[PDB]
């Protein structure tokens, strides 16, 4: 029921203003932390900016600190993005998410296109590691990595999401090892603390499976999403 649906995307020239917007539902909208994640075409997740229930907390990413103003309308249930000084790199498709708590993504929206015009941006304080593509075959299991640089793992929860080629990233797997509700059993989430890594398991295959996967925690400043791991069915 949950619903966030994605506004405002359009074509833009540099230097030029533009605000995205998005409606949410089927939640109290105050009573949570709004973000807004980024992705150019054939590119991983992005970070971009970060927002608490009351408003009070607002986190931006390193690309876009001061160009971009994040902030919402809690009377209107409106979460919307202000954008400055549209450069070239910021073409990609902004998605609306819900955060359960800071840097724990659990709903996620449609998405809205926005292109700046008159190679992918890289990915990964601290940085993620993943493969950059495993594969197997049907009904056999595989492990994804994810290991974390700098800061402790366990301090921060962990998160999956699979994203298929032209859908919406879902999650899979919140708080390390927690499963949304209607996420498959086989999808299971473990930590190894002394590796600082985060694995993601998928018992007995499908080929459905095949879609991207990306990880991602969080520390107290800003959200990181890992580069993503092509997971090939054969």
């Known amino acids: 029921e949950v619903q966030l649906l994605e506004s405002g995307g359009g074509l833009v020239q540099p230097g030029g203003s533009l605000r995205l917007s998005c409606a949410a539902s089927?939640?109290?909208?105050?009573?949570?932390?709004m973000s807004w994640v980024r992705q150019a075409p054939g590119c991983g997740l992005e970070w971009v900016s970060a927002?608490?229930?009351?408003?009070?907390?607002?986190y931006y990413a390193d690309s876009v600190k001061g160009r971009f103003t994040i902030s919402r309308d809690n009377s209107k249930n409106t979460l919307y993005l202000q954008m400055n000084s549209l450069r070239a790199e910021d073409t990609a498709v902004y998605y609306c998410?819900?955060?359960?708590?800071?840097?724990?993504?659990?709903?996620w929206g449609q998405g809205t296109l926005v292109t700046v015009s008159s190679g992918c941006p890289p990915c990964g304080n601290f940085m993620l590691t993943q493969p950059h593509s495993v594969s197997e075959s049907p009904g056999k299991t595989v492990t994804i990595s994810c290991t974390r640089s700098?800061?402790?793992?366990?301090?921060?929860?962990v998160q999956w999401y699979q994203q298929r080629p032209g859908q919406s990233p879902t999650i899979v797997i919140f708080?390390?090892?927690?499963?949304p509700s209607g996420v498959p059993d086989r999808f299971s989430g473990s930590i190894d603390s002394s590796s600082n890594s985060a694995s993601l398991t998928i018992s007995g295959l499908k080929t459905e499976d095949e879609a991207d996967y990306y990880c991602?925690?969080?520390?107290?400043?800003?959200?990181?999403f890992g580069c993503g791991t092509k997971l090939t069915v054969l």
């Open positions: 998410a819900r955060d359960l708590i800071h840097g724990v993504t659990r709903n």
């Open positions: 089927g939640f109290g909208f105050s009573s949570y932390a």
């Open positions: 927002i608490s229930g009351s408003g009070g907390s607002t």
């Open positions: 708080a390390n090892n927690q499963r």
């Open positions: 991602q925690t969080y520390d107290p400043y800003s959200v990181v």
């Open positions: 700098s800061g402790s793992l366990a301090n921060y929860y």
